[PDB]
Design a protein around this ligand. Sequence first.
Ligand code: HEM
Ligand SMILES: O=C1C(O)=CC(=O)c2c(O)cc(O)cc21
Ligand SMILES: O=C1C(O)=CC(=O)c2c(O)cc(O)cc21
Length: 403
Amino acid sequence: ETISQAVPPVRDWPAVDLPGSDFDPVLTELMREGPVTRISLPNGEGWAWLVTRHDDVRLVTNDPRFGREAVMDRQVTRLAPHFIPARGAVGFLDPPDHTRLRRSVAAAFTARGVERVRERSRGMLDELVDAMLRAGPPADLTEAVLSPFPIAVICELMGVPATDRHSMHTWTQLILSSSHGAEVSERAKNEMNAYFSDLIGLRSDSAGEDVTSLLGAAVGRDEITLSEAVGLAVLLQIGGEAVTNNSGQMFHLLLSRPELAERLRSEPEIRPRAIDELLRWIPHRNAVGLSRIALEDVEIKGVRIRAGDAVYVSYLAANRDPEVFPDPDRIDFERSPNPHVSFGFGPHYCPGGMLARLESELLVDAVLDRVPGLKLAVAPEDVPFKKGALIRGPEALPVTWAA
Ligand code: HEM
Ligand SMILES: O=C1C(O)=CC(=O)c2c(O)cc(O)cc21
Ligand SMILES: O=C1C(O)=CC(=O)c2c(O)cc(O)cc21
């Protein structure tokens, strides 16, 4: 019985700033190589496994045999020189503890929960768009709207005072500053970890609808510890700005394809489905994020993952799975059920998914029908994207309209 292979060599995945929303050439390679591959990233050390197919990604992210808690142990190979989550944040918690932590704020993030901030956010967005309309056609449709809106929405939902929004943005970008943008990221994490400790403890020891009040209440009832509450609050706060990057890519795409743009401009009722397809397609991040450690031996597509080995999943790769999404690279606003995974999978799935969709829907409504014929001020290829980041997106989005 011939001796075959299951030894894909370790392939280096250097830090590379990609153009616009173009797919990562290296990930394409890894995908076709096989369902299970091995990678080496800029920071940390080792060669972690990489899963890329839709079904296997769901398996790894939803199976108790793969944990996050142990990732803190050794120094797994990764993109960021530092680890983003705190030593007790949900990102580094497994089911037992992870479950009661997510349960503490779950009601604030369901479709029903986030719809409660819908109208409030709409007014907030109109104020930003109106201010832009007042300034003048030449505008940066990121600094004017895409950045300020998501920041205001997450701050209002978290219970962060408007006067502190600038601090949140400063710290978040230093932490997600592609991390290799220094490492000054650790001090920024600590400062943010101190801010939320104060907020949760200070004032949030009463009754409010905001998330920090909810967390403070849970801490007071001894349901979760401080630190657990702070760790979760910080990840929610930084994650809230993910909509800036993503919607930036969303509008760059739309403004690059007149066919797609007019259809959304003419058919408002198809916008929710269309936005979900865009979310599937847009390559949200550079490379991969946070791995999981095999807690025991597990076989994936004929490959034995040894206990202790690190394993990454690529949600971007899974969203381009030919088997699940026929003609993966094509943007089809109709799309069958299309269960992408841009918001992750398993216990760690994004708590902000519904909120992100709500924000994107409001942004599209305002940008397409509030601003008279908005359009890119330069060629799609001339739009500058962030070069040295974790979450991909425009550094600036030059636009004009018709006023
Ligand atoms: C279109 C915008 C967004 C995208 C594409 C996105 C995507 C993701 C992905 C891929 C993960 C990884 C799941 C894993 O660990 O395997 C994640 C986690 C997370 N996201 Fe988002 N996200 C978005 C917006 C948000 C927003 C607005 C918030 C704040 C409400 C948020 C909060 C979080 C948190 C707290 C986690 C960690 C969950 C955990 O480990 O339990 N996300 N997100
Ligand atoms: O763990 C990941 C991860 O592995 C990939 C991500 O994109 C991500 C993210 O966008 C936000 C997060 O809170 C966590 C992650
Ligand atoms: O981009 C990353 C990333 O590269 C690793 C992360 O762990 C992470 C995270 O825990 C939360 C985030 O919002 C983003 C990230």
